[PDB]
Ligand binder design. Structure first.
Ligand code: HEM
Ligand SMILES: CCCCCCCC(=O)O
Length: 390
């Protein structure tokens, strides 16, 4: 499956799979088997299915049995909510929801607008401006730094560490995790003494069962960094890619820019910046679309395929149409693990798109759509470059 044609445009393959092979077993780059689930109905149900596990210990045990080696238990910093099942997940999630509120995101928007305006100042000076390099790549970790409460004095080191929290180019996951942990532990202690208007402070001073331990707050911060950096980059890039490859619709959006909050969901659905969700492990035998998948197997659920499924969106699902009724989509997941950062991701996309279209009303792609490229993806997916003419 994982061919170059799939990498660049998976939608024809997803159409074949949804029709002919809605559960298809593949081998992943690590040598383990995975089962790719492509129909919207099955992706949604699987995300709601208590028989599927996100527990990292269970997943590594299954991976180790398939590859024949026992994998060592992972560090407790990895036991955050995205790597947990209930009841552990329920407690960690409840504390995070208490602090990471829609109101907190709304309150971050003034500074986010100011950050975007500064990034566009730098973009306006480039000889060959690129919306990925100049906007979609830098914005997410700036937003996460603001959300957490990282001081500007520590900015450059935080950015360096965050480039590992996705081992990425260096493989320094252990070293950077240790260093970032020591830094974030000191920041958590600083917010205990000197609380400020940020998420770490809100979690440190939470009451009752909403209060996690300092180590759990540290692990939560790691989940937010890994969960919201490359994903948001892909979402912002994908939304711009959708507009820029459909200039007639970009023109209409520019002419009626107040519609933007009611159009972003279609940009997200169409661009589908989440190719797969996090892996799921079967805790017991499960039947999906006529196929029995035994206990102990790994599922790969595709929001991108679900978002383009005509069973869920009968009218031209493989086309972008900003005028269609606001669609529901699976890009943020579904069920108990539904993206905690969805309002913050939306805000970054809305602010970025609005300010680009306002400041650069003639913005257009500098290449033909056929020249865009993607790299192989196991989670988030978007073009590797978005060169524009301003
Ligand atoms: C600053 C922005 C973001 C932050 C802080 C963030 C953080 C998180 C966290 C902590 C979780 C785990 C929730 C849980 O397990 O209960 C999560 C789930 C998820 N996030 Fe986000 N996220 C952000 C943006 C995004 C974006 C832009 C996308 C899509 C392109 C995305 C897609 C998802 C999905 C699909 C899930 C569910 C995963 C699954 O069920 O397998 N997130 N997010
Ligand atoms: C494998 C652990 C991932 C930590 C948070 C990721 C959330 C997401 O799927 O974007």
């Amino acid at each position: 499956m994982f061919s170059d044609e799939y990498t660049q445009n998976p939608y024809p393959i997803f159409s074949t799979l949804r029709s002919e092979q809605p559960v298809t077993m593949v081998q992943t780059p690590d040598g383990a088997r995975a089962w790719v689930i492509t129909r919207h109905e099955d992706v949604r149900n699987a995300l709601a299915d208590p028989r599927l596990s996100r527990d990292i210990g269970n997943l590594y045990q299954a991976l180790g049995r398939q590859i024949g080696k026992e994998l060592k238990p992972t560090d407790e910093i990895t036991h955050h909510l995205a790597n947990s099942d209930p009841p552990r997940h329920t407690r960690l999630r409840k504390a995070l929801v208490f602090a990471f509120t829609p109101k907190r995101v709304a309150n971050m928007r003034p500074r986010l607008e100011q950050v975007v305006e500064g990034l566009l100042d730098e973009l306006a000076a480039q000889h060959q401006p690129d919306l990925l390099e100049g906007l979609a790549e830098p914005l997410p970790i700036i937003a996460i730094a603001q959300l957490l409460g990282v001081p500007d004095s520590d900015w450059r080191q935080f950015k360096i560490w965050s480039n590992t929290m996705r081992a990425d180019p260096t493989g320094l996951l252990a070293e950077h995790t240790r260093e970032l942990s020591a830094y974030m532990a000191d920041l958590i202690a600083e917010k205990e003494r000197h609380p400020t208007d940020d998420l770490i402070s809100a979690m440190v001073h939470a009451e009752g069962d909403k209060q996690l331990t300092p180590k759990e707050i540290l692990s939560t911060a790691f989940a937010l960094m890994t969960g919201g950096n490359e994903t948001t980059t892909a979402l912002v890039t994908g939304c711009f890619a959708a507009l820029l490859t459909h200039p007639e619709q970009a023109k209409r959006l520019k002419a009626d820019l107040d519609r933007l909050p009611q159009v972003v969901d279609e940009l997200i659905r169409f661009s589908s910046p989440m190719l797969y969700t996090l892996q799921r492990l079967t805790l017991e035998d499960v039947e999906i679309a006529g196929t029995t998948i035994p206990a102990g197997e790994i599922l790969m659920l595709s929001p991108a395929s679900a978002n383009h499924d005509p069973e869920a969106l009968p009218d031209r699902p493989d086309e972008l149409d900003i005028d269609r009724p606001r669609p529901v989509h699976l890009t943020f997941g579904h069920g108990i693990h539904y993206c905690i950062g969805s309002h913050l991701a939306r805000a970054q996309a809305e602010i970025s798109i609005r300010r680009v279209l306002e400041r650069f009303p003639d913005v257009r792609l500098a290449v033909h759509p056929s020249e865009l490229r993607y790299r192989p993806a196991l989670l988030a997916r978007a073009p590797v470059a978005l060169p524009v003419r301003l």
